[PDB]
Ligand binder design. Structure first.
Ligand SMILES: O=C(NC1CCNCC1)c1n[nH]cc1NC(=O)c1c(Cl)cccc1Cl
Length: 285
């Protein structure tokens, strides 16, 4: 750890602080995550999970009660680029390129039985090259200072909210669907501020789920017959001015039933991507 010089604190999460740092010996600039203290073996698997759309875990440094993760550094995250692009919006061909790349990254994860579990714009890092990468794949002492982030539950799949313990790769598809919608419309799709507010915002848009559209729903841990019964609203009202290929794909990423939800791999074959390209964003570092 003496091999690293802090440049600045980048931010803090629930169980770790992130710094920009310089490797005194490689010359590399890196993002360093510090966690105050199975975990070690699952991190070592993370070291082998290498893909162009996954932030490269360069090193894991266990010292006798801290764990440091050393990542490749990227300058910008999607959350801030969305904020930066709010007045004009992200051009569609860039939206589609970022969506395709995250689908590639997830296709890869998923085929190796790795779930992200917590995708959100602030976890998606971007470079000058038009690349977008998955970061902060989903123990330790809690940072007392961590300040609460409104966006926290906004990307949570409904089966998580309903108490499914043994949820699947489909939760990452749901999250990415929510991100897709938000890029298109420049508004969060389901901006809940508690778990029941998050559930009810979903129900209001997509309709309260029942056995017809989601077999087994009524038997989930936190499901209540007393949930209000909202009617589903038209998708054309939900993400204008997205074209029918886009809306068709989004609809399949947002299926209630985890088993009907489109997989990352099938999503890459969707007609929305027939004309995909790789534009480069205009970033202001
Ligand atoms: O945070 C980073 N860069 C900042 C983006 C916003 N502008 C300044 C630079 C970064 N660069 N490489 C990796 C990361 N961050 C993460 O991997 C990460 C962790 Cl370790 C924990 C929670 C979220 C994220 Cl994204």
């Amino acid at each position: 750890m003496e091999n690293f010089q802090k440049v600045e604190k980048i931010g803090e999460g629930t169980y770790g602080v992130v710094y920009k740092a310089r490797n005194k010996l490689t010359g590399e600039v890196v993002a360093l995550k510090k966690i105050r203290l199975t975990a070690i073996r699952e991190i070592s698997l993370l070291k082998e999970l290498n893909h162009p759309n996954i932030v490269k875990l360069l090193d894991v440094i266990h010292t006798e009660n801290k764990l440091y993760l050393v990542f490749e550094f990227l300058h910008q995250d999607l959350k801030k680029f969305m904020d930066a692009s709010a007045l004009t919006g992200i051009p569609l061909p860039l939206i589609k390129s970022y969506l395709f790349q995250l689908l590639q990254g997830l296709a890869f994860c998923h085929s190796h039985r790795v779930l992200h579990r917590d995708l959100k714009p602030q976890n998606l890092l971007i470079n000058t090259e038009g690349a977008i990468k998955l970061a902060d794949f989903g123990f330790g002492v809690p940072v007392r200072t961590y300040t609460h982030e409104v966006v926290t539950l906004w990307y949570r799949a409904p089966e998580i909210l309903l108490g499914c313990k043994y949820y699947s790769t489909a939760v990452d598809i749901w999250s990415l669907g929510c991100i897709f919608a938000e890029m298109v419309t420049r508004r969060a799709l389901f901006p809940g501020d508690s778990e029941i507010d998050q559930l009810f915002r979903i129900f209001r848009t997509l309709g309260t789920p029942d056995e017809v559209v989601w077999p087994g729903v009524t038997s989930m841990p936190d499901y209540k017959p007393s949930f209000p019964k909202w009617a589903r609203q038209d998708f054309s009202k939900v993400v204008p001015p997205l074209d029918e290929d886009g809306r068709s794909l989004l609809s399949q990423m947002l299926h209630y039933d985890p088993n009907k939800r489109i997989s990352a791999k099938a999503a890459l074959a969707h007609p929305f991507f027939q004309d995909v390209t790789k534009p480069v964003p205009h970033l202001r570092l």
